[PDB]
Amino acid sequence: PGNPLEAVVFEERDGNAVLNLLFSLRGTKPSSLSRAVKVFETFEAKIHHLETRPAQRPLAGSPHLEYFVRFEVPSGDLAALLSSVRRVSDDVRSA
Amino acid sequence: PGNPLEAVVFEERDGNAVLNLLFSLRGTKPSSLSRAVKVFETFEAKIHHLETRPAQRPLAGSPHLEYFVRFEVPSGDLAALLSSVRRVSDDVRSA
């Protein structure tokens, strides 16, 4: 489906797009967040703040797995590597 | 070579090891930091704070590429996945 009023959005700066993206995964093996960094790095984008820190550990019984990231990619290549990020996540949103 | 007084060290907590590791890479393609997250995740370790943010961008002409991370792994499996991390980096140190 395609939600227009969804949270996943972005902006452009100096001719590129600066945005953030979060994504979580259950289990203990499915943690291919690594492939996610391969995205922003594939189109030589400029990462602002890539971070990963599963929940529970700090507090448990309220939060859940997470992964905060901020990066910038040409307004055109964004959609390019983002597709990959869509290839890694789908049921999440931007930060 | 093997430097004993080197910076790369670690500690153990509750029967596991909690430490930090930094590593940098030049160019634009060699950014396989992703494989690094595959390490701490391979032995189901507990990551405290994994982060990546190349230098220059904030300030240039003093710093350089970097990648700060903090994670914990059984005092035994640490050496296990760290070897992998050694398979990704060698000329760097802990945080």
CATH assignment of the domain containing B49: 3.30.70.260
**Residue among B33, B49, B57 whose CB faces A53 most closely:** B49
Q: Note whether B55 and B66 are within 8 A (CB).
A: yes
Domain of B42 in residue numbering reads as 1-95
In this complex, which of B34, B46, B48 lies closest to A37 when CB atoms are compared? Answer: B34
User: Which residues are CB-contacts of B75 (< 8 A; sequence separation ≥ 6)?
Assistant: B12, B15, B16, B17
CA trace torsion B1, B2, B6, B10 (10° rounding): 130
Phi, psi values for residue A71, rounded to 5°: -155, 165
Of all helices (H) and strands (E), which one includes residue A11?
strand A11-13
* Domain total in chain A: 1
Of residues A33, A41, A48, nearest to B37 (C-beta): A33
Q: Which residues of A touch B (CB under 8 A)?
A: 28, 31, 33-38, 41, 44, 46-54, 57
Experimental method: NMR
CB contact under 8 A, B51 and A50: yes
